[PDB]
Design a protein around this ligand. Structure first.
Ligand code: CNC
Length: 321
C-alpha cells in the first residue's frame, strides 16, 4: 500500500542516522525501521532514497555506502561501498545509475544489478578538496546536475558517452534541481553563509530552459536567507521550496508569492515533498538539529492532516506508491 519513507540524517560525525516509514492510511509512523529489520544501523548522514522495481536505495553520505532494501520488509538485499561521500542516485536503466558526491570531482557510475562501481565521470574545473555534485534531472539523453558545496554551476552530461558536455554558471551553491512540465529546470541557491571561505550573497531561485540551457527567470531573495529544496507536485506545475517558510508558486508565474504555504515558526524546516498522486505536502522540521524531528502533513490548501515524530534531522523523503 502507499507509504512514505523518511531518511533522518542524524548529526554529522555521530552515526545516528535512521530510517522512518509512515503509513498515510493509518497515520502511523515506525521509527528506526532499518535497525528493526536488519539488527544493525545505517551509519552517518542518510542523505536520500530512491525506489525502483521494489528495491529502495538509501544513500548514506558519511558512511561511503548505498544500501538496497526490500521496500516491503526493509531487509537489506545488497549494498555498494567505496563511494567518497555519496549524495543522490539517478537510474538510467536497470544496469546503470549515477551517484553524485561531495569532496570528489567525479560522479560514480554503478551497475545496480551487480552492485558494482563501473565507471566515473570527471567534472571539469573541480577537485577533491572542494568538489560537489548533487541532484540530477534527465532531459532526453542528457542529465543535468547541480554542483552545490563550494560550487556555482549546473553541468550537462551526455549519458551515451558519460561525459560532461556543457555547464552554466549561476549564483553560488545551487542546492537542488527539478524539471517542470514545460521542460524548464528550477534550482534555488543557498547563498553561502557569513564567514564562508567561498562566498556569501543573496540567494536566487532560477528557471532554466532545458533545451537551450539558458536562464529564463531569476528571482533574488535577501542576504541572510539560506533557502533549499525545490520540489514539484505530481503534474510538475507547482513549485515548492524552503526559505524560512515553505513557499509555493505556479511554474508559469512572473512574480514570487506574497503569502507562504506554511509560515516560519522559529524552527528549522529542512525537508519537503509533495505526494505525486494527491498533492498533500509533507514538511520535515529538524526543530533545532538536536532533538527528535517532526514531520507535518498538510492538505493541498495548507490544513494540517497529521504530524508525527521521526528521527534526528529528517532531510529527505521517498514515496512508495
Ligand atoms: C547548520 C549546518 C549544518 N550542516 Co553544514 C551544511 N549545510 N553547515 C551548517 C551551518 C553551521 C553553522 C551554524 N551554527 O549554523 C553552516 C551553514 C555554516 C554549515 C556549513 C557547512 N556545512 C557544509 C556541509 C557540506 C554539511 N553540513 C552538514 C554537517 C550540516 C548539518 C546537517 C547534519 N545532518 O548534521 C547542519 C544542517 C546542522 C548542524 C548542526 O547545527 N547540528 C547541531 C549541533 C548542535 O551539533 P554539532 O555537532 O555541534 O554541529 C556542528 C557541526 O555540524 C558544524 N558543521 C556544520 N556543517 C559542517 C560541515 C563540515 C564539513 C564540518 C566539518 C562541520 C560542520 O556546525 C555545527 C554547529 O557548530 C551536512 C551533514 C549537511 C548534509 N550534506 O546533509 C554537510 C556535511 C556532509 C559531509 N561533509 O559529508 C558545508 C561544506 C556546506 C557549504 N559549502 O556551505 C559547510 C562547511 C563548513 C565547515 N565547518 O567546514
Amino acid at each position: 500500500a502507499s507509504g512514505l519513507f523518511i531518511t533522518n540524517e542524524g548529526n554529522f560525525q555521530y552515526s545516528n542516522a535512521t530510517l522512518s516509514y509512515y503509513d498515510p492510511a493509518t497515520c502511523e509512523v515506525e521509527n528506526e525501521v532499518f535497525y528493526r529489520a536488519n539488527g544493525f544501523k545505517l551509519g552517518d548522514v542518510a542523505q536520500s532514497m530512491v525506489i525502483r522495481d521494489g528495491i529502495g536505495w538509501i544513500v548514506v553520505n558519511n558512511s561511503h555506502v548505498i544500501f538496497a532494501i526490500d521496500i516491503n520488509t526493509f531487509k537489506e538485499v545488497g549494498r555498494i561501498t567505496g563511494f567518497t561521500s555519496p549524495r543522490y542516485i539517478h537510474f538510467l536503466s536497470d544496469e546503470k545509475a549515477y551517484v553524485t558526491q561531495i569532496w570528489d570531482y567525479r560522479i560514480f557510475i554503478i551497475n545496480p544489478k551487480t552492485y558494482e562501481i563501473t565507471g566515473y565521470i570527471e567534472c571539469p574545473d573541480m577537485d577533491m578538496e572542494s568538489g560537489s555534485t548533487e541532484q540530477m534531472v534527465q532531459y532526453g539523453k542528457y542529465v543535468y546536475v547541480n554542483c552545490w558545496s563550494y560550487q556555482n554551476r549546473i553541468l550537462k552530461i551526455d549519458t551515451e558517452t558519460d561525459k560532461v558536455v556543457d555547464e552554466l554558471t549561476i549564483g553560488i551553491q545551487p542546492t537542488s534541481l527539478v524539471m517542470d512540465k514545460y521542460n524548464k529546470m528550477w534550482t534555488i541557491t543557498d547563498g553561502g553563509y557569513e564567514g564562508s571561505p567561498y562566498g556569501y550573497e543573496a540567494p536566487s531561485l532560477y528557471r532554466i530552459d532545458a533545451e537551450t540551457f539558458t536562464v529564463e527567470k531569476q528571482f533574488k531573495f535577501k542576504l541572510g536567507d539560506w533557502p533549499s529544496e525545490v520540489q514539484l507536485n505530481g503534474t510538475r506545475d507547482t513549485l515548492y521550496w524552503i526559505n524560512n517558510d515553505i513557499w509555493r508558486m505556479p511554474v508559469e508565474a512572473d512574480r514570487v508569492p506574497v503569502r507562504p504555504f506554511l509560515e516560519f515558526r522559529d524552527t528549522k524546516y529542512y525537508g519537503l515533498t509533495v505526494n505525486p498522486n494527491n498533492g498533500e505536502v509533507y514538511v520535515a522540521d529538524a526543530i533545532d538539529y538536536q532533538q527528535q524531528g517532526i514531520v507535518y502533513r498538510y492538505s493541498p490548501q495548507g490544513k494540517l492532516i497529521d504530524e508525527f515524530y521521526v528521527g534526528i534531522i529528517p532531510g529527505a523523503f521517498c514515496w512508495k506508491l
